Every structure is written in C-alpha cells, then in structure tokens.
Amino acid sequence: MSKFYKIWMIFDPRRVFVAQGVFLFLLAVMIHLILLSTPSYNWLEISAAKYNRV
Amino acid sequence: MSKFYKIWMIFDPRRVFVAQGVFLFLLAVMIHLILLSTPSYNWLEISAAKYNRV
Amino acid sequence: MSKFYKIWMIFDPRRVFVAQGVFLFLLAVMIHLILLSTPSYNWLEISAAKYNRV
Amino acid sequence: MSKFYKIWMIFDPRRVFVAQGVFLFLLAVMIHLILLSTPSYNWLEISAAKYNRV
Amino acid sequence: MSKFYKIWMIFDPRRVFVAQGVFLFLLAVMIHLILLSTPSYNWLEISAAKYNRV
Amino acid sequence: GYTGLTDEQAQELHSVYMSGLWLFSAVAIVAHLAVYIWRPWF
Amino acid sequence: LGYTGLTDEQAQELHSVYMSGLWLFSAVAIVAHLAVYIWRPWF
Amino acid sequence: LGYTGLTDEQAQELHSVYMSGLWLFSAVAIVAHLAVYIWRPWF
Amino acid sequence: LGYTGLTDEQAQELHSVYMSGLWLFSAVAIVAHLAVYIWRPWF
Amino acid sequence: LGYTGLTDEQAQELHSVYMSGLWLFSAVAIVAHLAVYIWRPWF
Amino acid sequence: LGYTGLTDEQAQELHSVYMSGLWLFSAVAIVAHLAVYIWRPWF
Amino acid sequence: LGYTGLTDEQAQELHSVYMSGLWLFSAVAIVAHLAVYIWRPWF
Amino acid sequence: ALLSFERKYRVPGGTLVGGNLFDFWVGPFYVGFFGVATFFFAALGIILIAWSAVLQGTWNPQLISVYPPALEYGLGGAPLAKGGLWQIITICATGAFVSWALREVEICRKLGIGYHIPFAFAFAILAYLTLVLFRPVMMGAWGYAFPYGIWTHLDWVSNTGYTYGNFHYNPAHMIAITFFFTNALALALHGALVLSAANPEKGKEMRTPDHEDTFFRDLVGYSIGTLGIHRLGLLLSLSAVFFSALCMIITGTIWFDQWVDWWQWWVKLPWWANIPGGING
Amino acid sequence: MVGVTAFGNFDLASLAIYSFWIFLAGLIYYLQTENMREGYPLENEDGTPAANQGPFPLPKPKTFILPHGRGTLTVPGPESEDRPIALARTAVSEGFPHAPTGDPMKDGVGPASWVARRDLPELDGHGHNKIKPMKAAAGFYVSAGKNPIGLPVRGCDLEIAGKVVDIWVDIPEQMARFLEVELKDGSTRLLPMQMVKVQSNRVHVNALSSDLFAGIPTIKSPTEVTLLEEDKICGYVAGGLMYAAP
Amino acid sequence: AEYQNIFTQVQVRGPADLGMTEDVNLANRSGVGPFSTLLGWFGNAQLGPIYLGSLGVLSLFSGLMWFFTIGIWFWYQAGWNPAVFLRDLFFFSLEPPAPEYGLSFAAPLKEGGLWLIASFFMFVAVWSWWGRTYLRAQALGMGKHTAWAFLSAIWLWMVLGFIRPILMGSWSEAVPYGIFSHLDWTNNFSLVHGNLFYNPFHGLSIAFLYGSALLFAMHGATILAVSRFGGERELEQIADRGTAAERAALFWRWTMGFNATMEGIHRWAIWMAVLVTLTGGIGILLSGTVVDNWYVWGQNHGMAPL
Numbered sequence A, B, C, D, E: 001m002s003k004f005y006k007i008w009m010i011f012d013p014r015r016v017f018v019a020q021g022v023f024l025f026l027l028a029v030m031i032h033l034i035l036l037s038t039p040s041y042n043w044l045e046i047s048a049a050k051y052n053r054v
Numbered sequence F: 001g002y003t004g005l006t007d008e009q010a011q012e013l014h015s016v017y018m019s020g021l022w023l024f025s026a027v028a029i030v031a032h033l034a035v036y037i038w039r040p041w042f
Numbered sequence G, H, I, J, K, L: 001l002g003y004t005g006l007t008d009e010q011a012q013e014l015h016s017v018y019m020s021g022l023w024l025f026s027a028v029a030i031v032a033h034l035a036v037y038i039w040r041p042w043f
Numbered sequence M: 001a002l003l004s005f006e007r008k009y010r011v012p013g014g015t016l017v018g019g020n021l022f023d024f025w026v027g028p029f030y031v032g033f034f035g036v037a038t039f040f041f042a043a044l045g046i047i048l049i050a051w052s053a054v055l056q057g058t059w060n061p062q063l064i065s066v067y068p069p070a071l072e073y074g075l076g077g078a079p080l081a082k083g084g085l086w087q088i089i090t091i092c093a094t095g096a097f098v099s100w101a102l103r104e105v106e107i108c109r110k111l112g113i114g115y116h117i118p119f120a121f122a123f124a125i126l127a128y129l130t131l132v133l134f135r136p137v138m139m140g141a142w143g144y145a146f147p148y149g150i151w152t153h154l155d156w157v158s159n160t161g162y163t164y165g166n167f168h169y170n171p172a173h174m175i176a177i178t179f180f181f182t183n184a185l186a187l188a189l190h191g192a193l194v195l196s197a198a199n200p201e202k203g204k205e206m207r208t209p210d211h212e213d214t215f216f217r218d219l220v221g222y223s224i225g226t227l228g229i230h231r232l233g234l235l236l237s238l239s240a241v242f243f244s245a246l247c248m249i250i251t252g253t254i255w256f257d258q259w260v261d262w263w264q265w266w267v268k269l270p271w272w273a274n275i276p277g278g279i280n281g
Numbered sequence N: 001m002v003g004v005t006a007f008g009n010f011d012l013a014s015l016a017i018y019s020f021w022i023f024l025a026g027l028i029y030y031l032q033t034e035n036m037r038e039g040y041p042l043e044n045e046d047g048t049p050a051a052n053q054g055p056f057p058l059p060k061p062k063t064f065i066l067p068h069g070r071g072t073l074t075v076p077g078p079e080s081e082d083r084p085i086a087l088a089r090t091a092v093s094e095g096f097p098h099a100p101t102g103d104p105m106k107d108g109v110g111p112a113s114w115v116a117r118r119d120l121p122e123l124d125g126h127g128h129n130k131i132k133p134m135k136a137a138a139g140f141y142v143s144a145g146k147n148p149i150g151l152p153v154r155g156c157d158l159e160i161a162g163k164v165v166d167i168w169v170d171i172p173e174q175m176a177r178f179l180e181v182e183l184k185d186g187s188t189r190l191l192p193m194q195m196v197k198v199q200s201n202r203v204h205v206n207a208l209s210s211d212l213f214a215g216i217p218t219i220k221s222p223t224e225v226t227l228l229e230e231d232k233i234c235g236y237v238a239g240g241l242m243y244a245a246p
Numbered sequence O: 001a002e003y004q005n006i007f008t009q010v011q012v013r014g015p016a017d018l019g020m021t022e023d024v025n026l027a028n029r030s031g032v033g034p035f036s037t038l039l040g041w042f043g044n045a046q047l048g049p050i051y052l053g054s055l056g057v058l059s060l061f062s063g064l065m066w067f068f069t070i071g072i073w074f075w076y077q078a079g080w081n082p083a084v085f086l087r088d089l090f091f092f093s094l095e096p097p098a099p100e101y102g103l104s105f106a107a108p109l110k111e112g113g114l115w116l117i118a119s120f121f122m123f124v125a126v127w128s129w130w131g132r133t134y135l136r137a138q139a140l141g142m143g144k145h146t147a148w149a150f151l152s153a154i155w156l157w158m159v160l161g162f163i164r165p166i167l168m169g170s171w172s173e174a175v176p177y178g179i180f181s182h183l184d185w186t187n188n189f190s191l192v193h194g195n196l197f198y199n200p201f202h203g204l205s206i207a208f209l210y211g212s213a214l215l216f217a218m219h220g221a222t223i224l225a226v227s228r229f230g231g232e233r234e235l236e237q238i239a240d241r242g243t244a245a246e247r248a249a250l251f252w253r254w255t256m257g258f259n260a261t262m263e264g265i266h267r268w269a270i271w272m273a274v275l276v277t278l279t280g281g282i283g284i285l286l287s288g289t290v291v292d293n294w295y296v297w298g299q300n301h302g303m304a305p306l
C-alpha cells in the first residue's frame, strides 16, 4: 500500500493533473450548486432572514 | 483463485484503470442522485425537518 | 464441456470481456430499475413505510 | 443427420457466435417483456396480490 | 509543499496563465452577478434604501 | 473451405458447440418445467 | 484456428481463471438471491 | 497471451498494488454503509 | 520499466510532491466541513 | 519529466514570481472579505 | 455448371446434409402441429 | 525563457513604461471614485 | 481592375443570346443579355418597393410591406394601391431571378465549367415560386402568398403555420428541418477540417488530405472524403429545399386539418390500436 | 430584470443586438481581407496596376510551410501568369473581350486555359505519388461499376478515337482520376474521369471530337503525372466544350 | 448524356488506409472495418479505424447511460409491452421536474428525478466528446477549428438545458427527452414569450441557417463544377493555385462582383455555421430573463406597428 508511487510510471503526469483539475472544479461547483438550490442550505438566504434584511 | 495477476498480461493497464475509474464515478453519482430523489433518504431535507429549518 | 477452453482460441479475450462487462452492468441496472419502478419491491419506499419516514 | 459439423466449413465461427448470442438474448428479453406485459404472468404483480403487499 | 516549483517543468507557463486569467475573471464576474441578483446583498439597492434615494 | 478450416477441425469444434447446446437446452427444459408446475399455460 | 494467437496451453490458463471469477460472481449472486427470497419472496 | 508485454514480475507487482487499493476502497465503502445503516436502515 | 518514460526515482519524487498537495487540500477541506458542520449540521 | 524545456533554475525563477503575485492577489482578497464581513456578515 | 466453384461430389454431399436437416426440422414441425391439433384443433 | 524573444533589457524597459501608464490610469480612477463617493456614497 | 490571372479568361463566346451586343464587363460584373434583363427587373422591383412605402405612409424599412391582393379578388388583377403593386414586384422578382440564373449559365460556358451552380439556384427559385405562384394558384387566390415586408413576411409564416396547428407535425417539414440542421452541421465540420489542415498547430507543415481522412476516422470512425463532402453539401441543401417546397404544396391543397392528427394513422394501426397502456392506448 | 432600460428603450436586449452589429462588421472586414491573399493587387487590361484597389486594404503576409520540403508559400506576394498569354484586345476601352491570336486550345486561353503550377507530382503523407497507374499500384482493383478497360472511346462527333488501356487512381483517396486511352497512333493520353461518361459498351467524351485526342498534352513519364501536366490536360479537354463543338 | 460527378461511375479499391501516426497513440486506434459498396457510390467505402482512448471511454459510456436511461423510462411508460413501446415511441417523454421544486434536486424519480440522472449523463458525454474532438486534432498537429466550432453548438445546448434553467430558477424550463415532446416544448416556448419570431437573435440565427444552406449549395456546386480541373483537392489548390481555383473565383467575381480564395471560402463556411448556434444561444438566454414578450418588445423597437 506504499507503492502507489508506481502509478506515475504508467500514467503521464501532464494528463493526470488536467483530468484531476477539471474534475475537482466541477465537483466543487456541483456541490455548491446543490447547496444553493435547496433553501435550507442557501447561505445567502440564511443570513438574509437571520439579520432581517428583506 | 490466485492467477488473476495474469490479467495484466492481457489487458492494457492504462485502459483498465481509466474504464474502472470512469465506472465508479458515474455509478457513485447516480446512486447519490437517487437518494436525493427519494424524499425518505434526502439527507439535506431530512436535517431540515429535524432541526426546524426552511 | 471440459473442452470449453477453446472459445478463447476463437474469440479475442479483450473484446469478449469488454462486451460482457457492458452487458452485465446494463442488465443489472435494468433489473434494479424494474424493481425500483414496481411499488412491491421499491426497497427505498418499503423501508419508509415500515419506519414511518413519510 | 450425423454430418452437421460441415456447417462450420461454410460459416465463420466468429460471425455465427456473435450473431447467435445477439439473437438469443434479444429473443429471451422479448419473451420476458411479453410476460411482464400480460398481467396473468407478471410475476412481480402476481406476488403482490398473493401476499397482499398493496 | 516546497517542491511545487517543479510544476512548471510539466506545464507550459503560457497556457497556465491564460487558463487562470479566464478562470479567475469568470469566477469573480459570476460571484459579483450572484450577489447583484440577491436583494439582500445588492449593494446598489442597499445604498438607496439607507440614504432614501427613491 | 470458405472459412479455411480443415475437416477434423470442424468435427472438433462442432462437438463442443453441441456440448454447450445441450447444456443450454437442459437448463431451458428445467426452467420450463419449473414454470409449468408454478403456473401452467396449457 | 488460433484467431486470437493464444496457444492451447495459454487458452487453458485463461479459461481456468475466467471460470474462477465466474463461479465467484455467481456465488455472490446465489447468496444475494437467497437473501432476497427470504426477505420478500417473489414466488 | 503477450498482448501487453508486461512480465510476470511486472504483472505480480501491478496486481499487488491494484488489489491493495481495492481493499482500501472497499473498506471505506463498508464503513460508510455500516454508518448509514445505523443512522437510517433500509431493510 | 514503465509506460511514460519516467525513472523510478523520478516517480518517487513526483508522487511525494503530489501527496504533499493532497494532504494540504484534504486538510483544508476537513476544516471547511468541520466549520460548516458546527455552524449548521446536516445530520 | 522536463516536458516544458524549462531548466531547474528557471522553474525556481518562475515560481518565486508566481507565488509573489499569488500572495499579493490573495492578500487583497482577504482584506476585501474582511471589509465585507464587517459591513454585512453572511454567517 | 460452375457459378460458385463447387463440384458434383461437393454439391451432392451438400444436398445430402442439407436435405437431412430439412427432414429433421419437419420432424419437429409435424410433432408440434400434432400436439396443437390434439389440444386445440383448427379443423 | 524565449517565448517572445525580449532580451531582458527590452522587457525591463517595456515593463517600466507599462507600469507608468498603469499607475496613471489607476490615479485617475482613484480621483473619480473619491469624487463619486463624496457625491453620493454607495456604502 | 482585373485579378492578376483574369486576362486569359476574358474571351468572346458562350452567350445564349446576342454574342457581342451585350458581351462585355462593367467593372467585375458580366453584362450579358440577361444582365441587362436582371438589372432592369432588379431596379424596377426595388423602386416599386420604395414607391409602395410612400403609399403605405412609412419610411422605417422594417415596417415597409407590400401586401398581396385581398382574398376577395381571387386569382385576377388588383388595384395598384391594394395588391397590384405586389403582382408587379412578384413579376419583377420572378424575372430577376430567372435572368440571374440564366446569366450564370453564360458565365459557366465562358469559363468552361459545369452547370451545378445555376441548377442549384433554380431549386431556390422553385421554392419561391411554390409560395407565391404555385400554391396560391391551387388554393385559388393571390392572397395566400406572403407579403414583401421584413417583419410582415414572418407574420405570414406564423399565421399560415398555426392554421394547421403546430406545423412541427408536418412529416415533410420534419424531413426538411433535418436536412437543414445536417447541412449546417456539415458546413461547420467542413470549414473547420479544411482550415485546420491549412493552418496547423504552429510552425508545422501544412497538413494533407490524408490527415483530413485520419482525423474524422479517429473521431467518428468514417470519412466521406474530399469529393464526398462536396457532393453531400450540395445534396443536403437541395434536399432541404425540395422537402421545404414539398411540405407547403401539400398544405391547404391535400391536407386541411391539424398536422397532429396525421400521426394517428400509425397509432391506430389495426394490430396495436387496442392494446392498453402507454400514451395513446 | 424585464423592462430595465439604461436609457430610452435600450435594455439588455438592445445592448446585445447593437453589440452584434459591431462584431459582424468586424467579422466581415476580417473575412473579406483574408480573401485578398490571391489575385491582388488589381491590374489594368494590359498588365499595369489599376488606379482603383477597393475599400479593403491588403492583409499581411502569412507563410505556408509545405509538407515535404517543397518550400514556403507566402501570400499575398509577387504574382505573374508565367506563360505566353496569346490574346489581342477587341477594343481600346476596358471591359471588352480579348480575341485569341490563333488556335485557342493549343495556345491555352479562354475556357482552355492552364496555370503554370509546380512541375512535380503531388505527394501523399508518406511522400509517394498521389496519382499513379493502376497496374503500378499494388492491390488496387475495380470493386464496383463497369470496368472501363478495353472499351472504345467515342468523341463528340460519334467517331471512335481509341480504347482505354489503364486507369490512373488516387492512392490515398482511392478514387479513379484519369483514363489512359491509347490512340490509333499508338500513343497514350490522359482523360480526366469527370469529363468521361462510361456507358455499357463504350466511353463517351462529350468535350472533344475524334480528331483532337492527338492534341491532348502528353506526360513526360509513363507512371507519373505532375501538377503542370494535370492542369494542361484538364484545361485542354474542358476547353473543347466551347472551342471544339462547332 | 453528360457526367455531373454526383455518383462515382467506377470504384477502385486497394489496401486499407490505416492513417498517419503523427503523435497518435497507435495502440488505441482499432483495425480497419468493412468496405461498403453502397457508400462507395457517393464517397469513401472504408469504415474505420476509430480512436477510442480515455475520453472516448468516458464519452461513450456516459452517452450509453444517457441513451439507456431514457430507453428504460420508455419501457416503463409502455408498461413493458413491446408492441406498445413500438406504437407510442414518438410520444414517450422523460420530463424535467415540476416548477414547484425550482432548481432543487428533491424530485421523485417519476417526477423529474430520472431527468436529472439522464441529464448528468448527457452533460458528461457531450463535454467529454468536445475534449476528444480537441485532443484528436492535437495528436495530428492540426488546428483546433473543429473544437471551437463544436463549442458554438455546445453553447446553445448549454443555454437550453443548463444555463437558462439556472437563471430562471427552475429545471422545469429545460427540454424534455422525447421526439414529439421536445417539439411541443419548442412550440410552447414561443407562445409563452410572445411570438419568438420577433426575437432579433432568432431572426439572425435563421439568417445563418439559411446562409449556411445557401453557402454550402454554392460551395458544393462550385467545387463539383471545377472538379474537372482537380478542384476537389482544395488543400493542394491552396499550396499551388491552379485553373480550378481561378475559374471558381472568376465565376463569382463576374456574377457577384466579389469572390473568395480556396482557403478563405472555408472561413466563410465555419463562421456562417457557428453563428447559427452562437446567436441562437443569446436569443434563447434573453427570452424570459430579459424579455418576456417579443412582439411587444418588437413594437417598441420598430419591427411592428403600434
């Protein structure tokens, strides 16, 4: 389990980082979108009602 | 039940790891999206009812 | 029956496993989705009725 | 009658084995879909009535 | 986290900087428009209500 | 000779092909017998 | 014959391991189906 | 055989690493399923 | 020796830099979840 | 490695400048967030 | 006559095997029709 | 580093002139924002 | 004012009418016998549209419309202020289009090339003649043709379409729309593929048609070829217009009701018309 | 934000429609100037540069590198019809036709024109010859259609002019390019496939008549055709529709 | 009769063209498939080989899941009857969630939940195919015009299904997965926004759909006309201008008064086609978000009498 470094002798580093970077951005946006969509976790609305702004 | 290591003498390691990685990503999201669709397992809505939120 | 090992001498092992892997997953996804559609076996809804989650 | 092996001196075994496998699975799913549609053999809905799950 | 300088021995500086510029600008414009939509954080409307400009 | 096999190669191959064929039909007969007991169609 | 280039000795090694995975796959399937039938039988 | 050129030394070393991650991934999934079952069972 | 023309010592160094950035990304994420969970738990 | 043509010193030279801009860009961002949270907190 | 590359011996044994299969298929057909006629006669 | 061919003397000379224009444009913007803010502040 | 290679191509001949009476170039344009006809018909029709504007009382170009004669006039003449001007402009437009197509034939003969271009333009003309002449003649009045306004000829399209419900359900409409979408998709692929070959990555040799086949075989597993793509582009557009004119020559002359009801012939086929379930059963 | 206008009726939809007019004007300028890389600057009827060059300025040169060490083409650049144009103007004024000073097909004018291209064969990506006779290309056969080999070749005068000897094929494209036709003189000429009509019992050439096949330009190698020879052959044959159908 | 070069009268077939390996990973490229005589009457006869790499696996498997998800919903909607499935194939539809849920993901699988699952598979499949379109050009050292032209069509695709429904605040604004279903959506989209004909960008988008049809008929007819001079090989005409390019240019010079080059006509072609979906995306994104009635907006902007 301490030989995972050998994955870099198989996959090209230039391709893994691009594949990983695209995936992490779209995963972060996807989860942030779900939280905003649900009114229970929409933090912009939570503060709006907490401080009686609208 | 031990000679399965020979499968890497037949199948390209690069293709196999990519197909397996694609499969798990698509499978994981589909199951997570199913649980959100079912109102009895939507963990965002479950906490809203429990903690008296929107 | 003991001579079934000659199928690989005819069919490419690489092509058979790809065709079989896509076959089984779509067969398994189809069968789960049929049980999910039928109210008598939708285990997500059966548990909800049992534990009064809806 | 005991001379049918000579069909394989006419037809490529690879195209027959592929065509037969496609044919049989398509035939089998078609019959299973005919039985699901007919309500007197819908074993999913037959079992619901027998154990009064609905 | 001291060897991160070696990422530039993998990725062309020209392509990285342009990609970040598009990403960083689009991200900021997205967040600014997301705030401008929400009436609670719309700083142009808040000033009007605070100073009674309508 | 269109497929390029010999005469004995076809004999060997067809022997296995029938071996699988009778295996498939044996399961099919058992499958059809089990259903007829459960719910006959005749 | 030998469309795939596998020798007779190599084909036996491939098929023997292939069946090992097949039987392992079905054994999980048999236990899975047995668990479901005890839980909610369909017959 | 000989479709990829990986030796037995390479195949054993590739399988050993891959199967190591399989149990690491399967263990995390098992804990997650056990955790969810305690919180909210589905059977 | 590989599929990508990377020596083992080169792979040893590259993986060490990668896992360093992965612990950093993971540790910051754990703080984010821990802060959000205390602020507003989802369980 | 070395797929870009930059030497070792050049990557050191480029990174030191890139990190300088990154901290300079982040320092303004933190003050920008600090001002906004004081004026109108979102938590 | 030609047109395919067969011979007198090749066509005769091709017909002998083919026609035997034709009677084998009709052997099943007669039995199936006879059982159906006993069950639900159409005449 | 020769992506464009500037010889580290043109780049210093070019960057000095660019920053001279950059500070001038920022200087006029600051005056304009200070004029608008005194006119009617947005905070 | 000639292209650097144009001197050896300006020779006398290949004129259907005349031969030297109207065999010259005015600037770059070739003035044939039908160039004189095209200019007269193009110019008269334009000034009539300008004149119809003053009768209408507007100068906004987007509001100018020439309406066909009302449905009460049937298939005869009309007053100029009502719909007579439309009939002159339609004649002028019909004369200008056919002269333009005929003038292109003289250019093809003088350059010694094939007549694919004038043939393809006649497909546009036949589609236009279907809407203003053939279809109104069948239906019985000139008032079914579209008016000559920038935004009012859209009102004719909208009003005619909704006479038969949603026009999407016209089966020949669906075929024609499919050809239009395929033609634009192939045009994007064809322009991009040739440009990428002529303009490679950077500091690279110009690619070859062997790279063009290889790119599309790598991508979608097939390549129609350099000759095939040009035959396809011509045939997709001619097919798109053919089924365009087909769908309107059958609307209001053979089919009169909602186009949605047409598709009930399939859903009411005798062998599955009564099977319960689904959307229609 | 429906109905929000910065001024008058200028809302976000007006900003979009007006921004497109500006973008389209810039695009039309770009697309037109990228099409002034051949045939410019404009000449007078005799060869001198014209006094009018048009609203659009010439673009800046671009270099095309050629795929097999064939050089660098820069456009727009110096241009010349590198050949003896044999024409005499029919009028002193401009805009009038130019009459040939002799036989038009041989002299290469009018619809029988040709361009002085590179006098080398066209090469595929492997560097070989793109066009070569079928008996030299290996493995090439007539997969479908009437094999037009051995059929007589009939001209536009309904007289036989020869019979087909071979087919020149495009190796990478895998399509027939020319028909090699042997004349009664014993020599061989190339006829482009687009100009022939292969019928069930003959090949009909509508362009040329019978007593013009001997005038088709010949090729300097029996198994190799160059761009200069292709342009002379194709230009000569297609020029017969006008100068050789009287 | 006269040969119009629309069908190949003679077909010639040789060794299978395996393509050129500029930087292509030759392992991923498959073997040459069959030869079609029917396709040979119109273009090339050779099918394959096809490059199926890493983005090919992701796109083909995601595209399979999108296609298979919609199919199973149609079998459910048919009551698992093969005849009813055949009968009502053009009437079945997978619909987005009801407008009561807004953009939330808490809709039941029968009320817009499977739509979200199928939509995710389509999102991955289409975007991965754009990456594959980009990477296939790069391995051959070619320009990226195909990738960026495809990005124009993806723009309208993302506006219809993702961007606008986010801006409108509900997934119910998006397009249902069906044959007659998405035609009804198109018809109803115009009626809700007041005669989409008066959208200036729908009008422009149509100008380039007709312009593409006009331009490909012109260009395709021009090349077949000068194909007798070796005009079909446009790539070698660019390198060394021949009599085909001069006659093609001089036809449109004498007809229209202006012409193009052999390379510049393909810049007209690519730019005319990308504006069909580039302009369409803006017009669709402006509908409801900025304008909720295009006939009334038109009346205030000329375009229509008061």
Ligand code: BCL
Binding pocket: M157, M181, O126, O153, O154, O156, O157, O160, O185, O186, O187, O189, O190, O195, O196, O197, O201, O202, O205, O206, O207, O209, O276, O277, O279, O280, O281, O283, O284
């Ligand atoms: C009554 C209905 C309305 C109307 C309502 C609409 C609506 C709504 C829309 C249009 C749109 C358009 N309309 Mg309209 N339209 C009307 C009248 C017309 C008339 C006419 C003569 O009356 C015409 C010619 C048009 C034509 C047009 C086009 C200009 C434009 C579509 C561009 C396009 O190609 O998108 C099609 C291309 C795409 C959608 C991109 C697809 C690319 C994706 C990424 C590929 C996915 C592939 C998929 C997964 C399948 C894979 C299969 C395997 C690979 C094999 N309309 C009337 C007035 N119209 C569209 C537009 O944008 O205009 C503003 C649009 O949304």
Ligand SMILES: CC[C@H]1c2cc3[nH]c4c(c3C)C(=O)[C@H](C(=O)OC)c4c3nc(cc4[nH]c(cc(n2)[C@@H]1C)c(C(C)=O)c4C)[C@@H](C)[C@@H]3CCC(=O)OC/C=C(\C)CCC[C@H](C)CCC[C@H](C)CCCC(C)C
Binding pocket: M038, M041, M042, M043, M044, M045, M046, M049, M089, M092, M093, M096, M097, M100, M104, M117, M118, M120, M121, M123, M124, M147, M148, M149, M150, M153, M237, M238, M241, O210, O213, O214, O217, O218, O221, O255, O256
């Ligand atoms: C058939 C396939 C497609 C096609 C092909 C095609 N079009 C062609 C050609 C070809 C092959 C030409 O060779 C020819 C040409 O030279 O193009 C540059 C042409 C052409 N297609 C044109 C336009 C055009 N094509 C269209 C469509 C299509 N053309 C098809 C989709 C459309 C659409 C869909 O609206 C238009 C507008 C021109 C650019 C040109 C023909 C020019 C011409 O006819 O010149 C002589 C006439 C005039 C100068 C104008 C006369 C004006 C009238 C006297 C008055 C106005 C009448 C008009 C009906 C008013 C309209 C009012 C409102 C409806 C706006």
Ligand SMILES: COC(C)(C)C/C=C/C(C)=C/C=C/C(C)=C/C=C/C(C)=C/C=C/C=C(C)/C=C/C=C(\C)CC/C=C(\C)CCC=C(C)C
Binding pocket: A003, A004, A005, A006, A007, A008, A009, A010, B020, B024, B027, B030, B031, B034, C025, C028, C029, C032, C033, H013, H014, H017, H018, H019, H020, H021, H022, H025
């Ligand atoms: C709709 O129906 C639903 C979806 C609800 C139900 C359907 C369910 C279905 C069909 C489920 C199917 C499930 C399946 C088939 C699951 C299979 C899962 C598997 C096989 C997971 C395997 C995971 C293995 C992993 C993650 C291994 C990872 C290994 C590494 C990360 C190490 C890699 C590093 C290496 C190899 C370096 C070595 C290199 C050298 C040179 C030694």
Ligand SMILES: COC(C)(C)C/C=C/C(C)=C/C=C/C(C)=C/C=C/C(C)=C/C=C/C=C(C)/C=C/C=C(\C)CC/C=C(\C)CCC=C(C)C
Binding pocket: B003, B004, B005, B006, B007, B008, B009, B010, C030, C031, C034, D025, D028, D029, D032, D033, G010, G013, G014, G015, G017, G018, G019, G020, G021, G022, G025, H001
């Ligand atoms: C609509 O109708 C419904 C769907 C409801 C009903 C219809 C049902 C139907 C038609 C069902 C059809 C079912 C069928 C035909 C199922 C067939 C299933 C099979 C054949 C499953 C076989 C599985 C075998 C497996 C998973 C084996 C896996 C083995 C491995 C992973 C080991 C890998 C191989 C190695 C390591 C070989 C190594 C040796 C060398 C030399 C490399």
Ligand SMILES: COC(C)(C)C/C=C/C(C)=C/C=C/C(C)=C/C=C/C(C)=C/C=C/C=C(C)/C=C/C=C(\C)CC/C=C(\C)CCC=C(C)C
Binding pocket: A025, A028, A029, A032, A033, E013, E030, E031, J013, J014, J017, J018, J019, J020, J021, J022, J023, J025, L001
């Ligand atoms: C709906 O979803 C929302 C938007 C609400 C939530 C989603 C949030 C997400 C997904 C946020 C993602 C945020 C991310 C990924 C942030 C990452 C930010 C980073 C990495 C910023 C780094 C910035 C660094 C900069 C700007 C550095 C610039 C450097 C310079 C300006 C110096 C110039 C560099 C030179 C001169 C190097 C040249 C070479 C030599 C040799 C000198």
Ligand SMILES: COC(C)(C)C/C=C/C(C)=C/C=C/C(C)=C/C=C/C(C)=C/C=C/C=C(C)/C=C/C=C(\C)CC/C=C(\C)CCC=C(C)C
Binding pocket: D003, D004, D005, D006, D007, D008, D009, D010, K013, K014, K015, K017, K018, K019, K020, K021, K022, K025
């Ligand atoms: C709508 O109208 C209705 C349906 C109501 C009524 C109309 C009915 C009509 C028109 C029915 C028409 C029926 C017809 C024409 C039936 C014909 C049936 C025949 C001739 C069937 C023949 C079958 C022959 C078979 C199955 C032969 C099989 C042969 C084999 C299995 C042997 C395999 C062959 C080998 C091994 C080749 C030997 C090779 C060598 C080298 C010796």
Ligand SMILES: COC(C)(C)C/C=C/C(C)=C/C=C/C(C)=C/C=C/C(C)=C/C=C/C=C(C)/C=C/C=C(\C)CC/C=C(\C)CCC=C(C)C
Binding pocket: E025, E028, E029, E032, E033, L010, L013, L014, L017, L018, L020, L021, L022, L025
């Ligand atoms: C809706 O969202 C809102 C708008 C509310 C929020 C969005 C906020 C955003 C996107 C903010 C972004 C702001 C940014 C990034 C602003 C950047 C401003 C910059 C970089 C301004 C720079 C100005 C520099 C100038 C004007 C320099 C001019 C230089 C000259 C005029 C002199 C030219 C000198 C030369 C050519 C040097 C020649 C020397 C040699 C040796 C040849």
Ligand SMILES: COC(C)(C)C/C=C/C(C)=C/C=C/C(C)=C/C=C/C(C)=C/C=C\C=C(C)\C=C\C=C(/C)CC/C=C(\C)CCC=C(C)C
Binding pocket: A030, B033, O067, O068, O070, O071, O072, O074, O075, O116, O117, O119, O120, O122, O123, O157, O158, O159, O160, O161, O162, O174, O175, O176, O177, O178, O179, O182
């Ligand atoms: C027997 O048949 C079988 C079962 C074997 C297979 C048959 C399959 C069949 C019958 C398939 C039928 C397919 C049809 C009719 C497809 C029609 C598709 C159409 C008309 C699509 C039209 C428009 C679709 C659009 C514009 C989709 C846009 C989607 C996006 C832009 C991305 C969507 C992503 C969203 C909404 C968010 C997803 C994100 C998360 C986190 C869930």
Ligand SMILES: CCCCCCCCCCCCO[C@@H]1O[C@H](CO)[C@@H](O[C@H]2O[C@H](CO)[C@@H](O)[C@H](O)[C@H]2O)[C@H](O)[C@H]1O
Binding pocket: N007, N008, N009, N010, N018, N021, N022, O300, O301, O302
């Ligand atoms: C051609 C490309 C370049 C275009 C010109 C460059 C500037 C681009 C922005 C121009 C914006 C101004 O454009 C101008 O906007 C005002 C705003 O209501 C319009 O509106 C004005 O006339 C209209 C129509 O009679 C009235 O309904 C309206 O009450 C009146 O305010 C003008 O009709 C338009 O001409």
Ligand SMILES: CCCCCCCCCCCC[N+](C)(C)[O-]
Binding pocket: M016, M017
């Ligand atoms: C609609 C106009 C049709 C005109 C067709 C062109 C003329 C064809 C006849 C040209 C030759 C006539 N003539 C007398 C020289 O034989």
Ligand SMILES: [Fe+3]
Binding pocket: M190, M194, M230, O219, O223, O234, O266
């Ligand atoms: Fe072209």
